[model samples]
Target: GSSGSSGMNIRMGTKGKRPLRSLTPRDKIHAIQRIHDGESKASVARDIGVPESTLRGWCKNEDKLRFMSRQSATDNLCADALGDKMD
Candidate 1:
């Protein structure tokens, strides 16, 4: 049985500790650009290698494709609302 019976490969000082890693949403937007480049999920995974689901989830968290689309509408509405004041 290979159930933690090694000499001393595993240490038990800190049970679970790792450097917290994260990226800015702005940086993630750049990743979305790469995703649109016809890059394969596998290749994208290898070079940038993470889970496909993880990337999708990242997009889910960071996706602004629609929001960006709606911003124009918002701007138009703002212009209409404040048209007299602005001009």
Candidate 2:
């Protein structure tokens, strides 16, 4: 009697690059506000589709982010201090 040996098949894990997402300053600020309002970072990150570590960094630089967002508004002339009048 002859026995046949079967070769083992090796399976490889799926490989792919993570999707790239760019968050605007306002988006980050909104996330920070949500966290400040009693939401967990993990939850916020998941909701915003951002990494929790990145959210942590944004929280650490909260002031800077707010300033940058306000700066952007000023640039667009949408700042409250700009008033609603154009000469």
Candidate 3:
């Protein structure tokens, strides 16, 4: 007796990719705030539905979040100086 082939079903190429979500300006600000607050990158990215690599790119390579981080540092410095004067 001869054997016959059976049909099989399979899914391909969908496992590794997550559907892309666009970030609103508010979401971008929130992400920058959490990053500056020293929250986990993995957590922040997941929370915002952004890829970790993209988050890192924004925070470092692209200079948008980098500029914000620097601005936050300067604001903290100015606040401390003003507090000293108020004492």
lDDT of each: 0.50, 0.70, 0.56
Q: How many clashes does each candidate structure show, in the order listed?
A: 1, 0, 0
Q: What's the true lDDT of residue 46 in model 1?
A: 57
lDDT of 2 by residue, 1-87 (tens): 998789555544655364323336777798789889999989999996977866787787688778887665333322122235667
Candidate 3 TM-score to native = 0.39
Candidate 1 residue runs with Cα over 4 Å from true position: 1-20, 65-87
Candidate 2 ranges with C-alpha deviation above 4 Å: 1-23, 72-87
| Best candidate (score: TM-score) | 2
The TM-scores of all predictions, comma-separated, are 0.40, 0.53, 0.39
- lDDT rank, highest first? 2, 3, 1
- Which is the leading candidate under lDDT? 2
Our tally of clashes for model 2 stands at 0
RMSD to the native, candidate 1?
16.7
Model 1 clashing residue pairs (backbone): 45-49
Question: Residue 35 lDDT in model 2?
Answer: 88
